[PDB]
Amino acid sequence: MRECISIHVGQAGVQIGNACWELYCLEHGIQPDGQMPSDKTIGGGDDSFNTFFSETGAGKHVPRAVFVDLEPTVIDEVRTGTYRQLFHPEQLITGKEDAANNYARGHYTIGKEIIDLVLDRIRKLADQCTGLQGFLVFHSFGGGTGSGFTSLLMERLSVDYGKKSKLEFSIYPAPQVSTAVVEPYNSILTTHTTLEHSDCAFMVDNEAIYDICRRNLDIERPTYTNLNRLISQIVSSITASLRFDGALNVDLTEFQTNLVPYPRIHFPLATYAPVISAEKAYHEQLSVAEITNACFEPANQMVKCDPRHGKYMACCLLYRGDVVPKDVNAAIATIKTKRSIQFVDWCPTGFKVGINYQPPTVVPGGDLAKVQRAVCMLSNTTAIAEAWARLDHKFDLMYAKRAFVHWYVGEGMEEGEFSEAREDMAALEKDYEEVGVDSV
Amino acid sequence: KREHEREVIQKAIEENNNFIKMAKEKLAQKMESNKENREAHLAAMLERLQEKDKHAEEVRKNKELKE
Amino acid sequence: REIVHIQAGQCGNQIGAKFWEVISDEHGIDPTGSYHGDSDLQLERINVYYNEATGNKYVPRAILVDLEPGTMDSVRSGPFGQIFRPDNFVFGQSGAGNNWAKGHYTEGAELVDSVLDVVRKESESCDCLQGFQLTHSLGGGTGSGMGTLLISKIREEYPDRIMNTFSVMPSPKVSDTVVEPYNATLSVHQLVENTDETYCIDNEALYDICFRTLKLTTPTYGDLNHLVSATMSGVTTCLRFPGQLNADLRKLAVNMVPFPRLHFFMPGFAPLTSLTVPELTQQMFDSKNMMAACDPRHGRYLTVAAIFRGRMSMKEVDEQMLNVQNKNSSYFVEWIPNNVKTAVCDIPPRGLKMSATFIGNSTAIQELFKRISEQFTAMFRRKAFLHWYTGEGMDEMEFTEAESNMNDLVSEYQQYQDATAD
Ligand SMILES: Nc1nc2c(ncn2[C@@H]2O[C@H](COP(=O)(O)OP(=O)(O)OP(=O)(O)O)[C@@H](O)[C@H]2O)c(=O)[nH]1
Ligand SMILES: Nc1nc2c(ncn2[C@@H]2O[C@H](COP(=O)(O)OP(=O)(O)O)[C@@H](O)[C@H]2O)c(=O)[nH]1
Ligand SMILES: [Ca+2]
Ligand SMILES: [Mg+2]
Ligand SMILES: [Mg+2]
Ligand SMILES: [Mg+2]
């Protein structure tokens, strides 16, 4: 009961998937062959970790996950790497030819050829669930598969699973590690087509993660591996309430009630602390107050924007590790007596808190210090729309001259789809302005 | 009150079904239109290429009516 | 995945031969087709350009074409000459005589179907064909006229694959053959419609580099060709080795070609053999390092791909790539954000600790086309040598049409050069 199915789409989706599932395994005591000695009920159970792992009679704990990509070389690494026994082969699905950084090929030309198979395999996961809660979909905005195949899949999932919850982890593009000039097109197309099919979406700005790696972990030139390890800690923090139990534990769905005041306003800002090197963490114990303080430092946000220049509609603090409410409450009181935390006039200002007692883990050979306590803040702030503004502007620059548009038109798309997607984005930025204006 | 309770849940059903139905139909429209557009793009390419052929035969034929 | 290589005519087969010798060495393949390298990175994407035969042998997926049998005897006797598949040699007996019409409409057309049979055999065995690359000159007769015929013929049968060319532009500094501007313009006319991406390998630039920079009093085709193979290796590195950026022909095109007709790239290389990352970077953007004789400060960049090779600091590469963009901002169009992409590959070319290859889509490429056009018109307005072409069946109209299309291409590169964001 309460199963969650993860779907990792395209390179970014898949590689972030690798990092998350490795991390989950370590958090839960699951070996790379899928065995979990601590689990005494063989071949099934209703433990909290079962929301993310099914079990075979032979004692294997198998991620409720599908990996999909239109070319094979990234998933081939999963097939042949360290956690290859973790996954049944049918959970890892590949085409022969990718979307070539083109939303149209991901959604139509190439995507249409593998979509029924993907849904077949997701259906196989669903049928093993006694109370499926919904899906978590991981993907880039910028890639052809991450953008166009994800959109197609989300549209088909609404049809096939009705209103079952769909949450995204969406990788927003940064010039430091982007690989296509047309990513702004792909980002707007997929955001427009997915918007009505997603209940909640956590954007991860590659530039924010890149900066955090450079600045807080002293990594000269971060690789995807560096980025993904940090992303996985954040993803882990958000899903921990689903995977562990606890008296002070608060379900992600409960935070969602507070995070989403209107269906379209469904993009929380995540902020994570502490991100600190082993070198800096040694003999330096960061207190509940210190990590909570860090949540209101914009440098620690997963999306670049300035909440101090916007308005809050919700603030949620998801703690893990050695943390009790007394200390949280005191930390919050201080922060209120000293910060630019302004709420819209129609929302209560109380911070919503959950605590999972299981301490954070790190992957061997990684950059993050192992710490006793960590926190992820999820806020609903009007400032997140800055990310849409930056992207919409880049789209406008190119689209005005119709730069690269022939690549999409050649794959069957119409200019009408571009203008329609861009207008939806204009309306979304307007939605974020409106919700911040005072009541009359 | 019971009548109203019955109407609320039937309303919730109707709207969810209508959402499914409309998602389903919008997708079929987009995929149909995309298929036709692409095919028409490829057809125009081939026709242009086949006029090139047409034109090269016409050229060899003119060389012959010159010799 | 798989690329199919076609080389047509003398130039095409010559620079084609060097290309295979050079990348074979890079991938640790010897003249017999056996691998004898030291790194698994050499073999990972080997199937992009090589077929694997029995005996752990690697056979370039390469097709060798000419209306003149001589060239493919010299090929067959070159160092890696025994590496090519015997059945993949398709030669006529006639010659083209630098007559584009012969290559395109008559002689070449007589031989084209046998070439297709070979392309089909190679394409059918591909797991997932990416597309094609063709090497040829535009000034001769076979490479230019038959080469462009092949393109259109292949496109009819593989309309959804990428067509890429390495096209050698003629220069009076290298060849006195008077009609070359006719052959080049007629070619460009074809390329503008039927290729997805063309590398402009300009003999004018090659000579000038060899003469001025390398201080070679008398450049041979050998000398020119050393530049060509170095460039060709560089601009194909992202296709042949594991990596993120432009790793296939379609992703390259999607990054580099914002308007379908504007697909003529200016390649560049550093160092040009009197070295730091800043120094590498500055030179790869210098006109003196361009393989097309055009000054990029006479226009603007639509898009750029930079490829660094060797052991070096990626941090420094990133900072220097940011530096050149900032300091030269005027020369990149503002209405294509982030239009410069950079790749770094660990494996340096033979004989270098590090190198940089440059691929620019610059509106300054019009200087190349204007130069051909000037030489075309000097002749066409005196109907000089036309009977060669009318004699094979062509008419003057096609000449006029080719000239107008090329003139249009120039106007289009100028249009985007003048465009602004506001
Ligand atoms: N954080 C992070 N970003 C990634 C990773 N891999 C790719 N990206 C980003 O994702 C975008 C590119 O999309 P991809 O996921 O690689 O492409 P794709 O979904 O496989 O689509 P196609 O290759 O076009 O079929 C760029 O913005 C990259 O910087 C990754 O492992 N981690
Ligand atoms: N860079 C270079 N150019 C060449 C080479 N061989 C011929 N060319 C050029 O190609 C043009 C003549 O075409 P060519 O290839 O010889 O005739 P074809 O055999 O009919 O294709 C002239 O402009 C020559 O300078 C070569 O090895 N290298
Ligand atoms: Ca169990
Ligand atoms: Mg991909
Ligand atoms: Mg010749
Ligand atoms: Mg010659």
Looking at C242, C258, C274, the residue that finishes a domain is C258
What is the biggest distance separating any 2 CA atoms in chain C, rounded to whole angstroms?
62
HSE value, Cβ hemisphere, 13 Å, CA-based, for A182: 33
| Pocket residues: Cβ below 6 A from ligand 1 | A 10-12, 15-16, 69-70, 98-101, 106, 140, 142-146, 171, 173, 177-179, 183, 206, 224, 227-228, 231
- Give how far the C-alpha of residue A395 lies from the chain's centroid of Cα atoms, to the nearest Å: 23
Looking at A346, A364, A383, the residue that finishes a domain is A383
Domain residue ranges in chain B: 1-67
CA–CA separation, C293 and C381 (whole Å): 25
Q: In this structure, which ligand is nearest to the CA of A186?
A: 1
Residues A50 and A164 grouped into a single domain: yes
DSSP state of A97: S
Residue ranges making up the domain that contains A309: 269-383
CA torsion, ordered C129, C131, C133, C139, to nearest 10 deg: 150
> Is B35 an interface residue toward A (CB < 8 Å)?
yes
Looking at C258, C287, C304, the residue that finishes a domain is C258
How far, in Å, from the CA of A144 to the mean position of ligand 1?
9
Residues C371 and C357 grouped into a single domain: no
Residues C57 and C151 grouped into a single domain: yes
Nearest alpha carbon to residue A125 among A78, A68, A173: A68
Question: Which residue type occupies A435?
Answer: V
Burial-class residue C381 by CB neighbours within 10 Å (0-12, 13-18, 19+).
exposed
> Is A119 an interface residue toward C (CB < 8 Å)?
no
SS3 call for A379: strand
Q: Chain B: residue nearest C161 by CA?
A: B42
Instruction: State the pairing for strand pair A373-381/A312-321.
Output: antiparallel
Contact yes or no for A89/A79 (Cβ under 8 A): yes
Query: What does the angle CA C380 – CA C382 – CA C388 come to, to the nearest 5 degrees?
Result: 65
Contact yes or no for C150/C6 (Cβ under 8 A): yes
CA–CA separation, A397 and C335 (whole Å): 5
CA–CA separation, C64 and C51 (whole Å): 16
The CATH number that applies at residue A396 is: 1.10.287.600
Report the nearest atom of ligand 1 relative to the CA of A15. Answer: 31
**C105 → closest Cβ in B46, B50, B60:** B60
Smallest Cα distance from A145 to chain C, Å:
13
Question: Which residue type occupies A383?
Answer: A
Instruction: State the pairing for strand pair C197-202/C162-169.
Output: parallel
Give A32-76 as a DSSP string: TTS--TT--STT----GGGGTEEE-TTS-EEESEEEEESSSHHHH
The CATH number that applies at residue C376 is: 1.10.287.600
CA–CA separation, A122 and A137 (whole Å): 12
Q: Which of A68, A105, A171, A233 to mutate to test the pocket of ligand 1 (most atoms within 8 A of CB)?
A: A171
CA–CA separation, A146 and A189 (whole Å): 11
CA–CA separation, C419 and C333 (whole Å): 8
Q: How many residues does chain A have?
A: 440
Instruction: State the pairing for strand pair C3-8/C50-53.
Output: unpaired
Bridge partners of C57, per DSSP, are C53
CA–CA separation, A23 and A17 (whole Å): 10
Give A270-315 as a DSSP string: EEEE---BHHHHTT----HHHHHHHTT-GGGBSS---GGGS-EEEE
Contact yes or no for A193/A426 (Cβ under 8 A): no
HSE value, Cβ hemisphere, 13 Å, CA-based, for C211: 11
The CATH number that applies at residue A374 is: 3.30.1330.20
CA–CA separation, C6 and C134 (whole Å): 5
Nearest alpha carbon to residue C136 among C158, C113, C161, C163: C163
CA–CA separation, C194 and C148 (whole Å): 8
Topology of domain B1-67, per CATH?
Methane Monooxygenase Hydroxylase; Chain G, domain 1 (6.10.280)
Looking at A367, A383, A399, the residue that finishes a domain is A383
Nearest alpha carbon to residue C416 among C191, C253, C200, C264: C264
**A411 flagged as catalytic:** no
Please give the order of strands across the beta sheet that includes A373-381: A269-273, A373-381, A312-321, A352-356
Bridge partners of C134, per DSSP, are C6, C165
Residues C191 and C298 grouped into a single domain: no
Q: Chain A: residue nearest B20 by CA?
A: A159
Residues C104, B56: C-beta atoms closer than 8 Å: yes
Please give the order of strands across the beta sheet that includes C3-8: C89-91, C62-66, C3-8, C131-137, C162-169, C197-202, C264-270, C354-362, C301-310, C340-345
Residues C134 and C73 grouped into a single domain: yes
Residues A60 and A206 grouped into a single domain: yes
Core vs surface per residue C336-349: b (16+ CB within 10 A) or e: bbbbbbbbbbeebb
Question: Helices C180-194 and C366-380: crossing angle, nearest 10°?
Answer: 130
**Residues of chain B found within 8 Å of residue A102, distances taken between Cβ atoms:** none
- The single residue of A77, A207, A254, A290 carrying the catalytic annotation is A254
How far, in Å, from the CA of C99 to the mean position of ligand 2?
13
Q: How many C-beta atoms surround the C-beta of residue A4 within 10 A? A: 20
Residues C360 and C374 grouped into a single domain: no
Residues C224 and C351 grouped into a single domain: no
Take residue C51 and report the two structure tokens written for it. 């077929």
Residues C88 and C125 grouped into a single domain: yes
Query: What does the angle CA C134 – CA C136 – CA C137 come to, to the nearest 5 degrees?
Result: 150
Burial-class residue A13 by CB neighbours within 10 Å (0-12, 13-18, 19+).
buried
Residues 7-66 of B with CB under 8 A from C: 42, 45-46, 48-50, 52-53, 56, 59-64, 66
**B35 → closest Cβ in A158, A410, A412:** A412
Residues A104 and A229 grouped into a single domain: yes
DSSP state of A237: H
What is the biggest distance separating any 2 CA atoms in chain A, rounded to whole angstroms?
64
Contact yes or no for C166/C124 (Cβ under 8 A): no
The CATH number that applies at residue C211 is: 3.40.50.1440
Phi, psi of C228 (to 5 degrees): -65, -45
**A159 → closest Cβ in B23, B33, B34:** B23
Nearest alpha carbon to residue A172 among A403, A388, A381: A388
- Give how far the C-alpha of residue A140 lies from the chain's centroid of Cα atoms, to the nearest Å: 10
Nearest alpha carbon to residue C242 among C165, C156, C334, C347: C347
Residues A372 and A423 grouped into a single domain: no
CA–CA separation, C7 and B61 (whole Å): 29
Identify the residue whose C-alpha is closest to ligand 2 atom 14.
Answer: C140
Residues C174 and C224 grouped into a single domain: yes
CA–CA separation, C318 and A177 (whole Å): 10
Nearest alpha carbon to residue B16 among A251, A158, C296: A158
- Token pair 């292949």: residue: C154
Residues A71 and A160 grouped into a single domain: yes
User: What's the structural domain count of chain C?
Assistant: 3
The structure was resolved experimentally with: X-ray
SS3 call for B41: helix
**Does the C-beta of C209 come closer than 6 Å to ligand 2?**
no
DSSP state of A384: G
**Residues of chain C found within 8 Å of residue A407, distances taken between Cβ atoms:** 253-254, 257
CA–CA separation, C403 and C192 (whole Å): 12
User: What's the structural domain count of chain A?
Assistant: 3
SS3 call for A340: coil
Contact yes or no for C11/C136 (Cβ under 8 A): yes
CA–CA separation, C214 and C207 (whole Å): 10
Point out the annotated binding site of A for GTP.
Answer: 11, 71, 140, 144-145, 179, 206, 228
Looking at C315, C343, C364, the residue that finishes a domain is C364
Residues C304 and C374 grouped into a single domain: no
Residues C154 and C251 grouped into a single domain: yes
The secondary structure of chain C, three-state, reads: CCEEEEEEHHHHHHHHHHHHHHHHHHCCECCCCCECCCCHHHCCCHHHCEEEECCCEEEECEEEEECCCCHHHHHHHCHHHHCCCHHHEEECCCCCCCCHHHHHCCHHHHHHHHHHHHHHHHHHCCCCCCEEEEEEECCCCHHHHHHHHHHHHHHHHCCCCEEEEEEEECCCCCCCCCCHHHHHHHHHHHHHHHCCEEEEEEHHHHHHHHHHHCCCCCCCHHHHHHHHHHHHHHHHHHHHCCCCCCCCHHHHHHHHCCCCCCCEEEEEEECCCCCCHHHHHHHHCCHHHECCCCCHHHCCEEEEEEEEEECCCHHHHHHHHHHHHHHCHHHECCCCCCCEEEEEECCCCCCCCEEEEEEEEEHHHHHHHHHHHHHHHHHHCCCCCCHHHHCCCCCHHHHHHHHHHHHHHHHHHHHHHHCCCC
CA torsion, ordered C97, C103, C104, C106, to nearest 10 deg: 90
| Resolution stated for this PDB structure, in Å | 2.0
Nearest alpha carbon to residue C268 among C316, C228, C300: C228
Smallest Cα distance from B22 to chain A, Å:
9
Straight-line distance from the first to the last Cα atom of chain B, in angstroms, rounded to the nearest whole number: 99
DSSP state of A268: P
Residue ranges making up the domain that contains C386: 365-422
Residues C409 and C348 grouped into a single domain: no
